[PDB]
Ligand binder design. Structure first.
Ligand SMILES: OC[C@H]1O[C@H](O)[C@H](O)[C@@H](O)[C@H]1O
Ligand SMILES: OC[C@H]1O[C@H](O)[C@H](O)[C@@H](O)[C@H]1O
Ligand SMILES: OC[C@H]1O[C@H](O)[C@H](O)[C@@H](O)[C@H]1O
Ligand code: NA
Ligand code: NA
Ligand code: NA
Ligand code: NA
Ligand code: NA
Ligand code: NA
Ligand code: NA
Ligand code: NA
Ligand code: NA
Ligand code: NA
Ligand code: NA
Ligand code: NA
Ligand code: NA
Ligand code: NA
Ligand code: NA
Ligand code: NA
Ligand code: NA
Ligand code: NA
Ligand code: NA
Ligand code: NA
Ligand code: NA
Ligand code: NA
Ligand code: NA
Ligand code: NA
Ligand code: NA
Ligand code: NA
Ligand code: NA
Ligand code: NA
Ligand code: NA
Ligand code: NA
Ligand code: NA
Ligand code: NA
Ligand code: NA
Ligand code: NA
Ligand code: NA
Ligand code: NA
Ligand code: NA
Ligand code: NA
Ligand code: NA
Ligand code: NA
Ligand code: NA
Ligand code: NA
Ligand code: NA
Ligand code: NA
Ligand code: NA
Ligand code: NA
Ligand code: NA
Ligand code: NA
Ligand code: NA
Ligand code: NA
Ligand code: NA
Ligand code: NA
Ligand code: NA
Ligand code: NA
Ligand code: NA
Ligand code: NA
Ligand code: NA
Ligand code: NA
Ligand code: NA
Ligand code: NA
Ligand code: NA
Ligand code: NA
Ligand code: NA
Ligand code: NA
Lengths: 719, 719, 360
């Protein structure tokens, strides 16, 4: 629900269990009053006013020294109001002045959920959602700012976006534009962020917010491996199952900044949106710019509920693929199996092997195009290497279909190698600075996807390939960060180009299962999930490390989105050995699939594949649609444990991987969550029965281990 | 010492106990090798190289994927090298391209210590110091960067500054310029910063550095009350008396940014310098810009030694005033005593009162000029209000001198009220944006001190006032933050104007004791200390709160710099009552002085003033020149305790203020520091003798308290 | 240098359910006398050691059938059993003398270089308030008598591993079996903890087989060697089952241990990491003159795209220059203590390293 009280100038947003409230003050500033547990109260009483030294006053406050935007909580604070905190908006006007001082002009409440020009965004119908659009303006900056709030009641989600219009005659530049700001007048908080590196993404870092700013971001042209565009502000003491916590998730696959600051008056400001760095976005007279969306949510009941709200929102209101609600073929991918050393016959052999085991699809990964026999050539030359494939792609696809298997293929359309026909013809299509030799990364360069002619060339090549036969699946990868950034519009316009190509591709090929990739999880974000219902979670396929990566990814993203494959050992990234069974349990917390040559496996491991596939298919709906619960913290605990529970709470699958081993082992219990306390549950394999209450308070004892890194799955059914 | 090894291209800086080492690599990049305990080793072995996903390579690295400025430690990292971390330099060139990719050109080693154009900086002689100047350049940006390193051996200090030259034909803008970068390839650290508000500055915040950035800064046009331009990076576990710690202190009174970041490879980067916000500094062809100086230091032996190194450096190599090495008159200030409600006769009465007590000087604070009978008019009208003073300033000064007292006066030259003759004549002299009504703070505006004509007008007025008689002391205040910033050069040029005026003033009046002020400690920085040997530490004169403010200020700044006065109770800022004796003990940790009307005091409190002054004068040299030790943490402990120890360790003064009170009190011991273990010390008042070892390990028991907030001073003399 | 015949040689001890108290050689099992066995081992150039557990009795023993009242028990109460055995009442001289005499007969059969004296359960059924203390007086009396009669014996104390790892025992035995856990990774924690009070030289530590018999974990032969050299060193496996490459590793391990034995046993010990929290278990021994050091490291954690891990040394002379042996690189003490040395990148789990430094 969205309500306006014209007398108090208060806007109230209600979801099923939360309330967000704002107010236009007597000077026209849009103040933030409240976000938290549902309330019908007017929360304007929380605002207080004192003469605070060096916190100065709008001219319009006259002699009232107690009124300062350096103290007051705001929906969209800006540089140019006298506020000295981190701010959401900076405009440099047609005369060179960095100032924006925004006052209320108008509003509208609409049924349904706004969409964003050229960008992914949460979607819903007119019954499920309402939109509030508030217009603010600065007559001196000659800017008009449209704040968009989307309210999805059942999901306990509030979205925010911004449109900025130049209302003057001269060009302005947008120098900083956040999507969302939460201003807290009170509270002690921790900041949870998800950091990492290539092949080890999304480690949880949780620290108290001390005085000053905790900040993180990306200027890589991508959402990045290093810091995901996501933040949780947890009240001190909040756990998985209790206490207040607030999320912000950026629906965007490019650059971002997140800032959390505890100020001089013990107030907290949280910002998420575009990066200020390499962002100086020109806006001509009468033109509008759109800031990408942030999804906000609140839980009074701990982190697990917060995550569940995000999982539901992403599956049902971000991902557009039919595969959200359909079985997804179990695939085998050629990359760790063969790298570049394959032929068409190799690929068909992989199909034959995989068909005998119950695998549904073979994905031919990198190495099929140009003269791509290593990673030093041929990006941009999306012509099939028929010498290597021993014939045409059409014929290969048919040979694979004759084995009863679907076919998938890898592409990397944003990129170019110097050693390519495309680069010899069009070296100026690479992103570069004139006269400067560019950074190389994996011995490749980015194509300038801000340019239509560049995108069209590559799009046409990709269409020729995909039109050769029935291709069920595409893995779209992106293997380096952006450098040599030549202008202040490029980071943003590049990503608009990517999304345009991706929308064109999905529209032309609407039955395709698109898996996003960027050296693993380098663009693991809700912007990508709007197009691809799964993303390759990491190039690290070590089961033990995957427990941490998958744990971290689960704070915002649903299991169904996490690409996860059983790979060979010793693992190719870590050198560690794990049992086949543990690799299976871990990879079932995601898309499942295989990425190895099964011909090298023992008969016993081949039979394990058969049984794994039967297990995954049996529990696929539960894993993908069920309510997810983290049952341990793999950074600190003896085990990595998680579970999925059906909507009706009548079925659950519990997964456990042991992380530590010593002699004379203590008994380890796994405590379950999300069950009905008074219901009785049957554990399948053992045939023992337990109450929900028992399973949640005492849990179940794990069988004693006899080897390292053992794993378990337990299935419970309500009697 | 400063050494160059041409074969390894290594520069080594040695102080008495520390070594800082850097190297020019085979591609021309200036890498940081080491900073820590003294060593003659070549520390290049600490550099390591791996193919790290998405950490890309200079073109000049060819096919070597293991070489990346996104991983390697650097002296002066920049935007435009492929490094994605926080960076030190961003240049936007004559074509609009944000890029700087700096390669080594040349160096020079010089005896002595460099100076900075228009700016305060550490100074020393040719025997005490050496300078290394390294020239780097980017031929595409057409920028030349001069890195300055100053080495003060005995002080264990290394200073850093930067000069940036435009070597092209078109204008460039400097968008970010740090002064110092420390890159650590290893280590777990905490970040100590000093945060606060008006009337409660420089609280210590110490937190672990988690993944991501801890940042703080000022865009107030001032160093600020909110975050001091100072940072300590302490290795985890470092205490007052053990462990590694690193300082950076900005010798600058304007805007700044500090960033500490723990990266994807568990490396740490620490930056300090100018703020990127409101900083877009134009540089014409052939012009040079100077970044203000940072003072670095390292201690292997804890935080107390680090602070002592800063105290010594600031007293002996920053402050230029003769009063560093001379008795400073004990003053009484009219502000809390009378506010605006005084006459010339009031002031003379205050002189008579104060003379009878042993006070040396009366300071006539705000209210003497224009029609300044409140804080709503007259800034800019620096004409004596002879009606209020009952005659001329010359006559007033003589009447005060006839009471045996020196005379001081308050000024606020950077500011203007709308209600002033100056503003009615020159409204365009205020900092403002054309067409926009400005922020007001204390109902005043800033004068545009970037403009010579504005500065000259005010300078001339101030000279007329100071030329009326023998004025021993000036308090130069500044009572609001900068807003309405109209261009990207203003923040920096404003401060150049302030320093120009301040240098002119100090040169014209070289015997003046200048006390800096900005609503208390709003510009409590080493830039100001170059001109003023003391700064009013806070408008909070509550003894209990002053224990925290003075504690925090001591991490970088010497006791001698901290303006501190005994004021009346109930305290005017907090309403709290404290004993006269406790106010005295607390205010003796600084300049000492009084700020009350002694005519309102009891005879017993007047006698306390007499004895306090005798005590302060007896211990003045020890307090101001002695080695300072924090003996407790007033945020956590039962007491606020500190001590000063003579150079020869033959004399010490220990001060204690109790902070907590309960019944049936436990015995509290104060443990001393900085004494000779085997020496025997006599405690004066008691006549008991103790070894240094005893005093440092067991300490001394405090006499039991009978009232709240009791204070103690103990004097020790070596036998 | 030596073979130790551990439990199983006496009475009819073919499992742990009989024969404690019956310290007569099982000549059927040994295929002849103990004297002959000792000689056959000496003929292979090897010293001989033997295990005893003199404080204990099984119900299934000749001693217990003759003297059931010699077990610690409460009259009328059936006693606690632990490893299916009971304690002998070592507060009683007659009990101690019986067993002492039996042990002497065994040790007098030949040149026995070494005895491992074990003790495999806790005391229960405590019948009076003097017993706990007087029992231990009895143990020490027997132990003093034994050491006085056999003054050239190397006595290793044991109690299911480190169940009596204390300075009282170290007065008699210069080493004690540190733990029955011979898993190298767990041993890094056990040895770390033991080092807070007890010298490396006291910690019995052996290279054992994998999968480890206590944890099921696999570790490389090299990592087991590095870990077991932080103590007495030794082996506890059948080398006939090993590959030729692992047999050659044994040869080289022994050469390494003997080369550094004095340094490890007499040198100043430094913990360089905390294995409960850190990426590595690292330690070093430094000579008295600070002219020689051996640094040992075992990695505990593994992830992809590994960060560089440095080991920071301690206990060196800051201004001295040290040569690292295998690499031939030279460093100041100050450098080694402040920056440390970067570890070579790992390619497998639980890798270990030894670095030797010599002052130039
Ligand atoms: O070069 C192909 C390779 O590229 C990236 O690393 C992907 O994340 C891998 O899964 C594989 O597709
Ligand atoms: O207005 C005068 C007043 O101004 C600031 O607050 C100063 O810090 C005070 O000490 C006093 O000088
Ligand atoms: O039974 C023999 C067995 O007894 C205890 O467990 C010891 O600690 C072992 O080393 C071994 O001697
Ligand atoms: Na307020
Ligand atoms: Na303000
Ligand atoms: Na202001
Ligand atoms: Na504030
Ligand atoms: Na606020
Ligand atoms: Na706002
Ligand atoms: Na604002
Ligand atoms: Na910008
Ligand atoms: Na807000
Ligand atoms: Na990855
Ligand atoms: Na991440
Ligand atoms: Na912070
Ligand atoms: Na970045
Ligand atoms: Na990033
Ligand atoms: Na990420
Ligand atoms: Na703060
Ligand atoms: Na707060
Ligand atoms: Na932000
Ligand atoms: Na990237
Ligand atoms: Na974009
Ligand atoms: Na992706
Ligand atoms: Na990705
Ligand atoms: Na990402
Ligand atoms: Na996202
Ligand atoms: Na599973
Ligand atoms: Na997996
Ligand atoms: Na979990
Ligand atoms: Na590197
Ligand atoms: Na790079
Ligand atoms: Na790059
Ligand atoms: Na990095
Ligand atoms: Na680095
Ligand atoms: Na550099
Ligand atoms: Na750099
Ligand atoms: Na800037
Ligand atoms: Na550095
Ligand atoms: Na103040
Ligand atoms: Na401060
Ligand atoms: Na951080
Ligand atoms: Na600021
Ligand atoms: Na500030
Ligand atoms: Na400050
Ligand atoms: Na990080
Ligand atoms: Na670090
Ligand atoms: Na900085
Ligand atoms: Na200020
Ligand atoms: Na300046
Ligand atoms: Na000042
Ligand atoms: Na100040
Ligand atoms: Na300051
Ligand atoms: Na300073
Ligand atoms: Na004092
Ligand atoms: Na004081
Ligand atoms: Na103190
Ligand atoms: Na025991
Ligand atoms: Na005893
Ligand atoms: Na023992
Ligand atoms: Na023992
Ligand atoms: Na013990
Ligand atoms: Na002991
Ligand atoms: Na044991
Ligand atoms: Na070793
Ligand atoms: Na061992
Ligand atoms: Na250790």
């Amino acid at each position: 629900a969205i309500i306006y009280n014209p007398n108090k100038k208060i806007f109230t947003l209600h979801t099923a269990h939360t309330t967000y409230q704002m107010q236009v003050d007597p000077l026209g500033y849009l103040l933030h009053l409240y976000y938290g547990e549902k309330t019908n109260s007017s929360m304007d009483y929380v605002l207080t006013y004192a003469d605070r030294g060096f916190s100065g006053n709008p001219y319009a406050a006259g002699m009232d020294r107690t009124y300062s935007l350096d103290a007051l909580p705001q929906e969209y604070p800006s540089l140019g109001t006298g506020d000295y905190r981190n701010i959401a908006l900076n405009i440099k006007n047609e005369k060179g002045v960095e100032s924006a001082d925004l006052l209320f002009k108008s509003y509208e409440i609409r049924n349904g959920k706004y969409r964003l020009q050229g960008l992914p965004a949460v979607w819903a119908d007119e019954k499920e959602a309402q939109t509030l659009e508030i217009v603010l303006a600065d007559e001196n900056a000659q800017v008009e700012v449209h704040l968009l709030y989307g309210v999805l009641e059942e999901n306990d989600v509030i979205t925010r976006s911004v449109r900025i219009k130049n209302t003057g005659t001269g060009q302005i530049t947008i120098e900083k534009a956040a999507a969302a700001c939460l201003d807290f007048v009170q509270g002690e908080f921790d900041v949870l962020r998800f950091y990492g590196k290539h092949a080890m993404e999304r480690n949880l870092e949780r620290t108290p917010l001390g005085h000053g700013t905790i900040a993180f971001g990306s200027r890589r042209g991508t959402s990045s491996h290093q810091y995901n565009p996501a933040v949780i502000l947890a009240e001190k003491g909040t756990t998985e199952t209790a206490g207040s916590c607030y999320g912000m998730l950026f629906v965007y696959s490019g650059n971002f900044s997140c800032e959390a600051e505890k100020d001089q008056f013990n107030q907290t400001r949280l910002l998420l949106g575009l990066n200020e760095e390499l962002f100086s976005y020109p806006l001509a007279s009468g033109e509008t710019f759109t800031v990408p969306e942030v999804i906000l949510s609140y839980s009074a009941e701990g982190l697990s509920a917060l995550s569940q709200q995000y999982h539901n929102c992403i599956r049902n209101h971000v991902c557009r693929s039919k595969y959200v609600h359909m079985q997804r073929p179990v695939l085998i991918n050629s990359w760790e199996a063969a790298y570049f050393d394959f032929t068409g016959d190799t690929i068909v052999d992989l199909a034959k092997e995989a068909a005998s085991l119950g695998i549904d699809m073979v994905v031919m990964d990198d190495g099929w195009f140009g003269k791509r026999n290593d990673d030093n050539s041929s990006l941009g030359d999306w012509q099939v290497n028929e010498t290597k494939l021993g014939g045409s792609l059409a014929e290969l696809i048919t040979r694979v279909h004759e084995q009863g298997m679907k076919f998938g293929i890898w592409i990397e359309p944003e990129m170019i190698n110097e050693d390519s026909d495309l680069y010899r013809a069009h070296p100026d299509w690479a992103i570069r600075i004139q006269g400067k030799k560019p950074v190389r990364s994996r011995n490749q360069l980015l194509l300038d996807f801000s340019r239509k002619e560049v995108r069209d060339c590559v799009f046409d090549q990709i269409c020729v390939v995909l039109d050769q036969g029935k291709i069920d699946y595409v893995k779209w990868d992106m293997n380096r960060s952006m450098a040599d950034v030549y202008a202040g519009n490029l980071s943003y316009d590049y990503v608009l180009g990517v999304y345009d190509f991706m929308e064109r591709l999905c529209s032309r090929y609407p039955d395709l299962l698109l898996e996003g990739c960027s050296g693993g999880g380098g663009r693991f974000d809700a912007g990508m999930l709007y197009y691809s219902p799964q993303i390759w979670c990491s190039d690290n396929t070590d089961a033990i490390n995957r427990t941490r990566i998958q744990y971290g990814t689960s704070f915002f993203y649903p299991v169904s989105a996490m690409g996860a494959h059983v790979s060979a050992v010793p693992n190719h990234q870590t050198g560690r050995v794990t049992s086949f069974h543990t690799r299976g349990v871990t990879a079932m917390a995601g898309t499942f699939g295989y990425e190895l040559n099964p011909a090298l496996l023992s008969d016993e491991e081949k039979q394990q594949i058969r049984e794994q596939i039967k297990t995954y298919k049996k529990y696929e709906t539960l894993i993908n649609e069920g309510t997810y619960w983290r049952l341990s913290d793999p950074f600190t605990d003896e085990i990595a444990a998680w579970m999925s529970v059906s909507e009706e709470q009548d079925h659950a699958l519990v997964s456990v991987v042991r992380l530590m081993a010593e002699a004379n082992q203590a008994t380890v219990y796994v405590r379950l969550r999300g069950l009905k306390p008074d219901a009785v549950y049957l554990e399948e394999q053992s045939g023992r029965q337990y109450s929900g209450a028992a399973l949640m308070h005492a849990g179940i004892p794990l069988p004693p281990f006899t080897e390292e890194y053992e794993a378990y799955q337990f299935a419970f059914t309500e009697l």
